[PDB]
Design a protein around this ligand. Sequence first.
Ligand SMILES: O=C1O[C@H](CO)[C@@H](O)[C@H](O)[C@H]1O
Ligand SMILES: O=C1O[C@H](CO)[C@@H](O)[C@H](O)[C@H]1O
Ligand SMILES: O=C1O[C@H](CO)[C@@H](O)[C@H](O)[C@H]1O
Ligand SMILES: O=C1O[C@H](CO)[C@@H](O)[C@H](O)[C@H]1O
Ligand SMILES: O=C1O[C@H](CO)[C@@H](O)[C@H](O)[C@H]1O
Ligand SMILES: [Mg+2]
Ligand SMILES: [Mg+2]
Lengths: 721, 722
Amino acid sequence: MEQEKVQELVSQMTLDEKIAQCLQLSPFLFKGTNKNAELTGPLLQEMKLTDAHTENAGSVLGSSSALDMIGIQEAYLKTNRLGIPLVFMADVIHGYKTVFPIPLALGCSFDRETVRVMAEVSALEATADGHHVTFSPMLDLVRDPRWGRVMESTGEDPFLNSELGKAMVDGYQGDASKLNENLEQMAACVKHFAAYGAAEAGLEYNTVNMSTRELYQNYLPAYNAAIQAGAKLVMTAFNVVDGIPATMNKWLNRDVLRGEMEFDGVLISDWGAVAEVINHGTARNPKEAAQFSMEAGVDLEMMTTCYIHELKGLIEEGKLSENLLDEAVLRMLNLKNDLGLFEDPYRGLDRTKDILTDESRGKARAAGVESAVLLENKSRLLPLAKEAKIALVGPLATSPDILGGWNVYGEEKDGINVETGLREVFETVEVVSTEYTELSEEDKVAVKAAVQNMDVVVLALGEKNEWGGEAGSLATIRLPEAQYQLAKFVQTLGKPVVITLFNGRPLEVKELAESSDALLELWFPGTEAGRVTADLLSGASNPSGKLSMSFPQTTGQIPVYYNHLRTGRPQTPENKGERYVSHYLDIPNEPFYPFGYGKSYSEFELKTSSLPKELNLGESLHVEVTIKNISDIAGKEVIQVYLQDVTASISRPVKELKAFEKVALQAGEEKTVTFELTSEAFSFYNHQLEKVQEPGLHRVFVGTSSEDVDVFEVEVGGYVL
Amino acid sequence: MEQEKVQELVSQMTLDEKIAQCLQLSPFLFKGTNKNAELTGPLLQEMKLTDAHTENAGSVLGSSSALDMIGIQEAYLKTNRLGIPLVFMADVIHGYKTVFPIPLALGCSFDRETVRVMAEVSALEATADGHHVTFSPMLDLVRDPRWGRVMESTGEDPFLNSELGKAMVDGYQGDASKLNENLEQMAACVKHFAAYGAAEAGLEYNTVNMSTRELYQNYLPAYNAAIQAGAKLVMTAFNVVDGIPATMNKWLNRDVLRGEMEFDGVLISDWGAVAEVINHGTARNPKEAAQFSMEAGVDLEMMTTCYIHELKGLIEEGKLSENLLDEAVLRMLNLKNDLGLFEDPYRGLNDRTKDILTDESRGKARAAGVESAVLLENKSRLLPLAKEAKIALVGPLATSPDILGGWNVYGEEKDGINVETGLREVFETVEVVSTEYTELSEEDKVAVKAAVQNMDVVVLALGEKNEWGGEAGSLATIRLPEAQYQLAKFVQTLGKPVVITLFNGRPLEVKELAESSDALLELWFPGTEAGRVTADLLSGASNPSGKLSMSFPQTTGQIPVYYNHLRTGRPQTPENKGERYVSHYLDIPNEPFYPFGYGKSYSEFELKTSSLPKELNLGESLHVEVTIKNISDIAGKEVIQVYLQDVTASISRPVKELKAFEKVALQAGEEKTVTFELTSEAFSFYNHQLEKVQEPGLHRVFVGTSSEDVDVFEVEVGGYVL
Ligand SMILES: O=C1O[C@H](CO)[C@@H](O)[C@H](O)[C@H]1O
Ligand SMILES: O=C1O[C@H](CO)[C@@H](O)[C@H](O)[C@H]1O
Ligand SMILES: O=C1O[C@H](CO)[C@@H](O)[C@H](O)[C@H]1O
Ligand SMILES: O=C1O[C@H](CO)[C@@H](O)[C@H](O)[C@H]1O
Ligand SMILES: O=C1O[C@H](CO)[C@@H](O)[C@H](O)[C@H]1O
Ligand SMILES: [Mg+2]
Ligand SMILES: [Mg+2]
């Protein structure tokens, strides 16, 4: 409908109606839900909720289905005074029913289009099952693989997360202004604002702390890119930011998000995060919690009752301006309108035919093959011949747990396990399945026997997803020790070994790499994992992923990341072995596998056209890269361009990723791609918080990982374009 | 002399002269040195130094002896135009020749007097051997035991480090207005300014980064306390602080150090930290390095040549003002003066040798060792051991002379007392099988089996070599070599009671050691009398009374873990135990293996807090009164501890903060009363705007014998301001 009528609806609301609009609830607390009705009484009573609260609640999160949604919205609109429909939100993180690779894997794709296809397919399916909003993209920069939630981030690099973050939003929302029309798309909600993934000790919900300059330089860029690209919501974070819980952080949310970033959409709290400021000890009680969170501009309280029970009193005693509430309600209604819920509360609703199609599955498969990373492949063991005799052993041989974490809707019975997968392709396969956390003598005899018959071992190891995701912090980033022992065992059997590793985080893999001939990191590919796995092993697909997060030498190296500072005593090749340089006595400084590292069955040669020696301030560097696949085999490479600022008023990272592109090349084929490094890429935040460019020398690095690069020099100065 | 004669020295000094006054060099680049006279030729020619440079050099670092000093100074004065003597500095960190426990151990003493006596004995000896300035206390807060330098800090607590920091300055310098008179006292230099101990990944020299508020709240207090206690010098840090290397960080050093902390002394660079701002990528070359460090107020460049080769040109070209150099030179001379060098450039050097490595001094180092060690485990009263107990003494620390610890630049191992020698003095029957640090052979095991079979108890002496810590001794995994845990596993199967005497420079993973033995005693590195420290504790001649000044993590992946932590929005409680969506790990407990303030005794105490007021005004002190009784037959010391928590505040506040502590001696039966004043400063914190503030509201007071063994009382602050 029209803006003016929305502005009117605010006018016509009671105070209690407005307060309730700022509440969000689980489906089974509304009249007319069709699942979990036997939890409605107990919980309603514990939250001290009444019919007036539930009949005016702003939103719903975690509807179980299209049918669940319809019954609730049909029932709500029957008893709702002014006919303000519910907005319905859900966690569509990496697939709705067609599960795609976990976002950390998606980052390893280094492939913008894959990310967009994933979100688009996800929206297709979610909108079809009644949901208006996904709580995705998750844009927290991660440098600490102990934290279970690294699985939701696209890795340790702000640029890559920024790009892929834009692709996710584009994919879910398409045209952000036609969400009232395009009902196969949905609102995206950026999370978690901000800096959540710097939790101390990878410990869930734990303290985050960093200088403001570093917050802007590295932790904010991606939330900003998604926002600037039209993301409709932002969700707050659980952590403090500089001492102050993000949910009630006024500078962060008013000054930075609404001020600097110009975000005039709904700001939703994370689950309980409004009331939990009480636990952080920056609010004495639910009254204070609500006052400070409203002051901060949190418009939608997620499944707690601070606003519901306390805003009226705050407004009547003049502790809190009613305009703030008014503005918050106005944002909620603008959201609903943008989704066309004033014309159609059922947002297009039967669409079952669209869920879990064969075209969608093929896409998830394509995502999986794009995202897997080949870490080792000694003496061309991979790809395997289709008639190769295979002992498939390990806990991931038959396990149905290949969908990854934050899979709220996808069903394991629709999944393709590794056995099924492999059997579709290779004729001879013998399988000895083993426990995730044990290695018995009986297992070893069975494995001995399966291996002796066969020609090659596919050793499938991995985590259960429940060992990652939210509140899945591992102090030690290792598989259960039994799996390292199973690899040591299997290696003694005389036969060639592939390890197909399934997980949600960087792990200590040195032992795995040292005990096998090849190692293929599939992360958690989703619904089609088995076939992703088979197509890569068989060569039907050629591995092309690159690591979007560093793989540490050991737990004690964390945090280790490619974009690191030099220090005053950097280790060089000409000071190696000296005592008084930055190093460890017991491990290398280098991570075991670095950012941008990945292998292929193909082989490539790159050359960079001549670049200018000199450059003006404000001027863009145009980089031209010619790349040839010099091998019999078709496949993709990921060209990567980095910049270093050799000298600056702040110590600058030795490298920073400024551009990348995945390039498909047939056997023999050659191509040219060109990048624009605009002058922003030469910029940084200074000691005073200004975004600035300084004349001086930069190095440009073109290559195929953060470490395989040719290096060029460029001098910036003169005048400003 | 008088300040006029000093002000005039500045006026009469040439430019080239004033510059060289801002240079410090190793003893063997000087004419007159009694050691390393080779090396002088090539290093001078590498540094492109002259005689103009060395004849006017400001200072020396790390002279080898009183004769070295005297030789250098005598020869320098002979050819020095205006007669400005050299100031002579050194790393006297935990002792000179009589070596005391490493500073981390000293922290575990929880005893100010012990620390002051260490510092006092250290200056006594150092001045006797020619040194004017020590590079100590090291006041970097440490939360990460991977870092080799945790050995030099007194731990993870700002308050404790502040207090013991002042005891150290007080002990080295006594009354600092009379350093020209008490020539058995010496100038002290606080380091490393600032926040150096927060090195990322505990990796040496690595990036440091934290909000300015956190810098002020936790990382600054100790530097500040030592400075306010009158510490003569400060040294810069190798690390960046918010992007900028500390050495050229104007705000940190002009605004914070010289402005807010009102420090008007020499600011010395750390070794090469001036030229090294180039490697940090905040200076193109020695010209800018020099410019930016002088702009920042660095007065003395340590063993690099940016100032000497670049300050002339910078001043002539007008890029840098001669006033800065001048005031820099004035602080230099004011320090020489304060030291009494214009009256006596040999600072009293008169058979000061009678003063070194004395019997009284060694007895003090010994007492420091027994104060500082920490009894971590003692099941079924195995310790103390009867003096007629037959002892199998096995392990790498059985006979190792490596017991003086790291940053021991002057102490000699031949004077050290090793564990066998210590034990043999006390217990009649000792059999000894030494093993390697990093191995466990089948032959070793056979020998251990045979020794243990014969004796009644195992003293299993495990440890680090000191070179696995100190500077640039970072460990990614904080474990002993695996052979040592395997040795403990082995010994435990021999059916005899086991004590592990652990010697180290950092918190280690010790769950496996605790689990494979009946008692565990953490001697750290006690210094010259290590063996007797160990024997006395084991025997009961001394009663363990140390407490942990740094948390002992469950495993490496728990780092950083410390007592003074924030609550988060989803704290693990005893009520929510076992729930998935709470702050916790899947594979280990939240808690460290041993917490801050944790320590055991052969004695047993009760404590009783006198009734506290329910309310308090702003600006008002809280007087906590504690009665403590040793209810046991054994005399011993206990460390009463008082913490505060600010329950609600404009910033999420630590669950606990140590605000007072005292070590209380007690005979069997004996009772005493101590009272502490927690001022309103203790109730204060830094807010978002960076004001030091006090908020009305609820605080909890915790009185006890560790961060975990406490009685909790509440106090409500408000009303008006005192
Ligand atoms: O706890 C949470 O619940 C939210 C709702 O499921 C989810 O979207 C957030 O990412 C997560 O932090
Ligand atoms: O609610 C959840 O469900 C998921 C189940 O797939 C789990 O992995 C997530 O980490 C958890 O947040
Ligand atoms: O961290 C900082 O960097 C700046 C430069 O050191 C300084 O000027 C600011 O006041 C300070 O907060
Ligand atoms: O490198 C160093 O040398 C200095 C000189 O010994 C010492 O005092 C510092 O603590 C240390 O950083
Ligand atoms: O980090 C910060 O936290 C402060 C409190 O939110 C804010 O006011 C400042 O702008 C900022 O320096
Ligand atoms: Mg530059
Ligand atoms: Mg308070």
